[PDB]
Amino acid sequence: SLINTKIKPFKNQAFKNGEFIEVTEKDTEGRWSVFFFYPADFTFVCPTELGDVADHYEELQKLGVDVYSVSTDTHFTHKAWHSSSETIAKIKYAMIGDPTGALTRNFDNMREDEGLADRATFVVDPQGIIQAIEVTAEGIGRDASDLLRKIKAAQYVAAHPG
Amino acid sequence: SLINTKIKPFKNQAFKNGEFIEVTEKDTEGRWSVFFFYPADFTFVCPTELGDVADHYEELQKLGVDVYSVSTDTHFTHKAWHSSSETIAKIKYAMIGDPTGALTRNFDNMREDEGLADRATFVVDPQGIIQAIEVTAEGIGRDASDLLRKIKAAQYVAAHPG
Amino acid sequence: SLINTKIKPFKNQAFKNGEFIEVTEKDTEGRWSVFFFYPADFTFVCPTELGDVADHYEELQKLGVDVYSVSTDTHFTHKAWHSSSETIAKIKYAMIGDPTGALTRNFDNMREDEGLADRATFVVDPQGIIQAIEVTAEGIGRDASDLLRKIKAAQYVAAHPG
Amino acid sequence: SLINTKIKPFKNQAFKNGEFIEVTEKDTEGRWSVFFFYPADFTFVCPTELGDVADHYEELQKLGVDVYSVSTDTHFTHKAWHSSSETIAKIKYAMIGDPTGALTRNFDNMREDEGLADRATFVVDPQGIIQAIEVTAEGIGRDASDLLRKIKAAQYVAAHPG
Amino acid sequence: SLINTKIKPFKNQAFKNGEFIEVTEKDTEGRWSVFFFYPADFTFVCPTELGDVADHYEELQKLGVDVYSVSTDTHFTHKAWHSSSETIAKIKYAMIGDPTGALTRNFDNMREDEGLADRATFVVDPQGIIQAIEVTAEGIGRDASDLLRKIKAAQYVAAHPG
Amino acid sequence: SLINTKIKPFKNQAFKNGEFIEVTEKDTEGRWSVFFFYPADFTFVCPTELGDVADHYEELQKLGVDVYSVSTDTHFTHKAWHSSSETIAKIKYAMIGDPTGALTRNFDNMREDEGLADRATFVVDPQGIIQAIEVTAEGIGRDASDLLRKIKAAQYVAAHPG
Amino acid sequence: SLINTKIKPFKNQAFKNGEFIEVTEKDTEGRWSVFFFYPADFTFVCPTELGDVADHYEELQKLGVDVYSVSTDTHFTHKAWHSSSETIAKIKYAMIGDPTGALTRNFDNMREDEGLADRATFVVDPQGIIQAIEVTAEGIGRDASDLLRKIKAAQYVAAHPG
Amino acid sequence: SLINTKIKPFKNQAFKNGEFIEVTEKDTEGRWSVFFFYPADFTFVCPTELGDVADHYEELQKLGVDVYSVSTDTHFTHKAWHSSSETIAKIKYAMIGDPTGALTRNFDNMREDEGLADRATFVVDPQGIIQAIEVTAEGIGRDASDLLRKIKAAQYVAAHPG
Amino acid sequence: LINTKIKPFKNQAFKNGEFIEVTEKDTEGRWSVFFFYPADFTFVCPTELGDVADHYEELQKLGVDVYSVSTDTHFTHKAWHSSSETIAKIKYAMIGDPTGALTRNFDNMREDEGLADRATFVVDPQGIIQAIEVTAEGIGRDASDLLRKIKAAQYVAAHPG
Amino acid sequence: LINTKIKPFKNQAFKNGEFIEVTEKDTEGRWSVFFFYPADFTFVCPTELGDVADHYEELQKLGVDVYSVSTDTHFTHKAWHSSSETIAKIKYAMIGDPTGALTRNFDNMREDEGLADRATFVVDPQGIIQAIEVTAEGIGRDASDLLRKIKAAQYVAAHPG
């Protein structure tokens, strides 16, 4: 699958704490990154998954992990949504917009018939190698705590080969 | 160009004051239709172009003309925008979501670069034949009156062939 | 569509009050241009659409805008029409002949069925980028004022990007 | 070449004595037809060639020959030209318009780089078989009297095989 | 992705509590299934992941869940391993051999250059639809507890749409 | 058409007043040329057409015009015919044999199913440009007088552009 | 090689003692045939070859062997050559004319760059099978007596197989 | 047949008396090699074949003949099988593991629908040429003594050509 | 080609003084050994061919059959059989394959020489290739190892599992 | 193939007791007769081959050369030459063509039999095919008519026009 492969290049606008930033594969370099994809902003689904992440952001920032949530929504939408849902408001990590689906497709995570990304979370090590993958159907939640457990395990393994 | 061609079939989710509805080309047969494409919801630009159309919904509706505004945003976002923006709130016409970009592409009006539609308006007669096309860049705005003048001309030209 | 694309190179014969001239895309570089396509010369329809443009040549010329009307008629016919019709006589802008239909086809505006161009107008900025497209069927006419409004908007949008 | 081959189908609007008629291969059936192509109406070339034909029309109509002059000009133009040049005014035969070049191309007589027909005259017998062909460069005239001489010879041969 | 897609047909031999049986896609029809893939039998990594799952085999069984561990080893090798390791001896669920690697490739889970399946688990509903995916690199264990949670969650979402 | 196009390279053997020579496109460079094609030597049709041209061979010679009669017969056959017929014996111009049929096909003048050239004459200027074409079916003679007229006319138009 | 292959269908005009006839593969069915190809009529080379065959034609006809000399000249030229040469005059067998070159090509015997057939003789049996395929370059003659020997030899082998 | 062809490059892991090693075509260059393929480790069939080869391995090593038994099982399984079977235990030659199936396919010896190699032995000389390609179906055994005879015979022919 | 079914073929050949035709049908319902070699009448020793000769009466009693094959015609085999004493011992069909079709069916052609490689194929009653044996020049085939494979093949056919 | 230049080739063959290699170069600068036949050792009469034998000393005195060809190997030709009395008279090179390349160069292959058709080709010193003669079985080639064509070909080479 995509496991154990290096992420592909990319150029996306995002929303992070009030300001609009731009992101590329360059920023992922040397760092541990988590790409958290979800289908769409402003739906009626519980914004709970993204909240769990936000709730563990401080703990992740401590581990030296960057988080990018991704939807095929424009970064503009992320802004308006970040100031509507009280859950979303808690988000301090970058909220990437992928209206061209290019980032989503780089990760083979596009629901082609919907123009929306699937619920998938990727863990990329400092070298750009995808080390953990998780995808679920609408409705099956992703545990932010299991995500942490794996980020730690990944790093331990990166340092204790064999 | 698409001038004088029949519209390709489609099926998209829409927001029509309160209710989500499914629109297809089947809904357009028999009526005069107007497809008002635009870049995106929740942008910092002026929702003027869309609001103005609402200002004439009275007349248009009188003229047996329906209005389908289209963006590659999901109908979920349209709803959250409709009831979060003054001008957007005036809209009583169906607000189509085209996250797959298929409707947009049938109208050859996609910024493959951004994943957003361009500022374009289409007049479709009851037979589904495009009678008028209008496309402008960011900044040059569309004029609601000019649109109505055309629709009237279009309706008239139909009455007295050649 | 051709919106936001650069015009393809061309070389056609034209009539400009008295003189026959050769126009190319080289003539359009640096200026704002307007390509006014129409079906044919000597038709029993109303030369109104063309005459009106002349009515605004004053201003347009002020705005540093040139006008190239185009039909798949030869420049010979344009001359015989210019000095045989009142309204046509007001024309001080270059009248292009496109008997090969190449210019028309670069603008994807040909009725392959008839060998005549469709009622379409194009606004091209100094870089050769189409900024506004307008196409209507027989009967629905184009409005000279609306055209000027766009050109002004187009010129302005250029001045203060985004 | 095209000699001795049957003409291909066609549908063209024409101008004949004030009224606009339509022509097809059907009308050529059972009759002797002469397709007289020329480049363009309203030029500065001497309209003399078409005049010679007109001058012998009565004599040809007596022989049971139909004449169709053809230019890639619209039948509309033929009308306005028939009432401008005093020579053209003499024309009693149908003046076909071939703005789609389809008729011109059926006879392999299109100057593709110009969108105009070449100076060619074809003689089609009652069965649709091309029996005489003549093409000349701009400037070399066609003798209407030689055309007659050949139409007669054609018919004599049609009746005196071997 | 493979999320929300239907598992493909397959036919493999497996070892299940002392005996050899055949398993196909038809045995999963109507039940919930877990496809647990690992690289190889008899390696030196701790068989903790497969032990975890054995410990919960009763929970999953009460829940109408079938477990299938999969490696590209033969079923003969599984039978043997089931006797070497005390951990592997707890396993009561079916151990599928996949030497042809077809079942593994169906799940796009093959490390092609090693001919071994990656560490990936798939939760499949009674309709053969993949509702959850989990894949990790060597060293990053998979918790049988998190899998149970996700399974209950999937069973819940299938019986409480909203 | 072939009108106004350049003749192609060719190399054939010919009979010219008692001797055999070679003719190529290089012998036409710088001169006016007439390529007179006929179906076959020794048939029963009257050799009037080739006699006509012989009668005017002096006119054409004074005018700087070369005559080349062409058939798909060999040059040996031409030499012989030049003795059978009294008419053919008048011929002083070159008689080209074209058994390979290449010269004939260059002029797109081959009756493929008979392997004989059609009755066609080509007038070529000193630059190798075809200025006049004449083709007739069997029985319809070609007048050497009309050919002279056209030639003078061509020579005139080349030295009096307008 | 064409040895041992069935001759192909053909239809040519020929000159046989006084008049013109049509020969096809049908005429050869049931008989033994000699197809005698030669380059050209009226050349300067003595018709010894054709004459020797002529001398043995009574014998050949006894053996039930039909003869067809072939060249790319027309039957017209054969007639003229026949009634103008001592040797050719003796010929009482059909002289096929092959100006389209099809028959010559059927026997793959064309000198393409000359448009003339090569000096080749083919013996064809009643079933249409080529049994002797003597071919020689210019200058290397053929012997009628040797031809007769081969025909007798072939006729014998057909009577006494193996 | 692969007889008389050079073996292809490969790189596999193997189990050779106690530890794991890497074997490539390089290791075979300059030596005589026996590639002994078999379906699978731990199956129920007695390892008589592998054991007989083991019995004659001292003799084979005298003759300078290297042995590599191969199966699609991993080297891990070979180790476990080796230290768990009387017969397998005797083996002192390298036991190659071919889970990707590449080596097996190199020798076109794969039972594709089973993912297991067929029972085939290949004798390869110092230059890499296959000199004896014994292959048998399941049940049809192989004799080590006969293998030794062939190797001696092959070694002789290399010393005494022709 | 191991475990595949032989293809259809039609060649001329020789068998004890007379000419016959051999097709897959002759192998249909029978057991067979297709023994390919490069060429009749060469300076190389017909050892292999004489070898297979001796066990022929025995193979025949097993309903088993032998067909030697080369790209020489059947006519040449008849000549060789009545000239080389080793070859004269042959009582099995000597197939001629001048078009190379039979040889290529078994993917056993040296394209650069128009000759078949030294290769033995054991085909069961259902036409499946089981005991295949191919060796380079100078490496001999033990008419004894072949027989062992044939009996093994028959035993497995009769006693699966 | 009339009036075309022969192609390059490399085959093994026999010539008076020993083996040699023949290529187009051997024909380069020489005159040649390529005489194809179906097969050595068949029941058909080697009449044609014995025929060409007799004029060989004569052809040789004309710097002319003869190469008989079949898809049999050179080894088989050596056997046939030392077995058939007719064949024993042969002193010209007997080319072996088991791959069929030489035969196919001259477009003279019976693909369905892997054997060359009965066909004679006369090739001049520049390698151009002039006197080509091909006949079906039973129709003989007159070693006399061939010679006549060879001399005619030499005469024309020496005296154009």
From Swiss-Prot, chains A, B, C, D, E, F, G, H:
<dbReference type="InterPro" id="IPR013766">
    <property type="entry name" value="Thioredoxin_domain"/>
</dbReference>
<keyword id="KW-0676">Redox-active center</keyword>
<dbReference type="GO" id="GO:0102039">
    <property type="term" value="F:NADH-dependent peroxiredoxin activity"/>
</dbReference>
<dbReference type="GO" id="GO:0042744">
    <property type="term" value="P:hydrogen peroxide catabolic process"/>
</dbReference>
<keyword id="KW-0049">Antioxidant</keyword>
<comment type="function">
    <text>Thiol-specific peroxidase that catalyzes the reduction of hydrogen peroxide and organic hydroperoxides to water and alcohols, respectively. Plays a role in cell protection against oxidative stress by detoxifying peroxides.</text>
</comment>
<keyword id="KW-0575">Peroxidase</keyword>
<comment type="similarity">
    <text>Belongs to the peroxiredoxin family. AhpC/Prx1 subfamily.</text>
</comment>
<dbReference type="Pfam" id="PF10417">
    <property type="entry name" value="1-cysPrx_C"/>
</dbReference>
<keyword id="KW-1015">Disulfide bond</keyword>
<dbReference type="InterPro" id="IPR019479">
    <property type="entry name" value="Peroxiredoxin_C"/>
</dbReference>
<protein>
    <recommendedName>
        <fullName>Alkyl hydroperoxide reductase C</fullName>
        <ecNumber>1.11.1.26</ecNumber>
    </recommendedName>
</protein>
<dbReference type="InterPro" id="IPR050217">
    <property type="entry name" value="Peroxiredoxin"/>
</dbReference>
<dbReference type="GO" id="GO:0005829">
    <property type="term" value="C:cytosol"/>
</dbReference>
<keyword id="KW-0560">Oxidoreductase</keyword>
<feature type="domain" description="Thioredoxin">
    <location>
        <begin position="1"/>
        <end position="156"/>
    </location>
</feature>
<dbReference type="InterPro" id="IPR000866">
    <property type="entry name" value="AhpC/TSA"/>
</dbReference>
<dbReference type="Pfam" id="PF00578">
    <property type="entry name" value="AhpC-TSA"/>
</dbReference>
<dbReference type="InterPro" id="IPR024706">
    <property type="entry name" value="Peroxiredoxin_AhpC-typ"/>
</dbReference>
<dbReference type="GO" id="GO:0008379">
    <property type="term" value="F:thioredoxin peroxidase activity"/>
</dbReference>
<dbReference type="GO" id="GO:0045454">
    <property type="term" value="P:cell redox homeostasis"/>
</dbReference>
<dbReference type="InterPro" id="IPR036249">
    <property type="entry name" value="Thioredoxin-like_sf"/>
</dbReference>
Swiss-Prot record, chains I, J:
<dbReference type="GO" id="GO:0045454">
    <property type="term" value="P:cell redox homeostasis"/>
</dbReference>
<dbReference type="InterPro" id="IPR024706">
    <property type="entry name" value="Peroxiredoxin_AhpC-typ"/>
</dbReference>
<keyword id="KW-0963">Cytoplasm</keyword>
<dbReference type="Pfam" id="PF00578">
    <property type="entry name" value="AhpC-TSA"/>
</dbReference>
<feature type="domain" description="Thioredoxin">
    <location>
        <begin position="1"/>
        <end position="155"/>
    </location>
</feature>
<keyword id="KW-0560">Oxidoreductase</keyword>
<dbReference type="GO" id="GO:0042744">
    <property type="term" value="P:hydrogen peroxide catabolic process"/>
</dbReference>
<dbReference type="GO" id="GO:0005829">
    <property type="term" value="C:cytosol"/>
</dbReference>
<dbReference type="GO" id="GO:0006979">
    <property type="term" value="P:response to oxidative stress"/>
</dbReference>
<comment type="similarity">
    <text>Belongs to the peroxiredoxin family. AhpC/Prx1 subfamily.</text>
</comment>
<dbReference type="InterPro" id="IPR050217">
    <property type="entry name" value="Peroxiredoxin"/>
</dbReference>
<dbReference type="InterPro" id="IPR019479">
    <property type="entry name" value="Peroxiredoxin_C"/>
</dbReference>
<dbReference type="InterPro" id="IPR036249">
    <property type="entry name" value="Thioredoxin-like_sf"/>
</dbReference>
<feature type="active site" description="Cysteine sulfenic acid (-SOH) intermediate">
    <location>
        <position position="45"/>
    </location>
</feature>
<comment type="subunit">
    <text>Homodimer; disulfide-linked, upon oxidation. 5 homodimers assemble to form a ring-like decamer.</text>
</comment>
<dbReference type="InterPro" id="IPR017559">
    <property type="entry name" value="AhpC"/>
</dbReference>
<keyword id="KW-0575">Peroxidase</keyword>
<dbReference type="GO" id="GO:0008379">
    <property type="term" value="F:thioredoxin peroxidase activity"/>
</dbReference>
<dbReference type="InterPro" id="IPR013766">
    <property type="entry name" value="Thioredoxin_domain"/>
</dbReference>
<keyword id="KW-0676">Redox-active center</keyword>
<dbReference type="GO" id="GO:0102039">
    <property type="term" value="F:NADH-dependent peroxiredoxin activity"/>
</dbReference>
<dbReference type="Pfam" id="PF10417">
    <property type="entry name" value="1-cysPrx_C"/>
</dbReference>
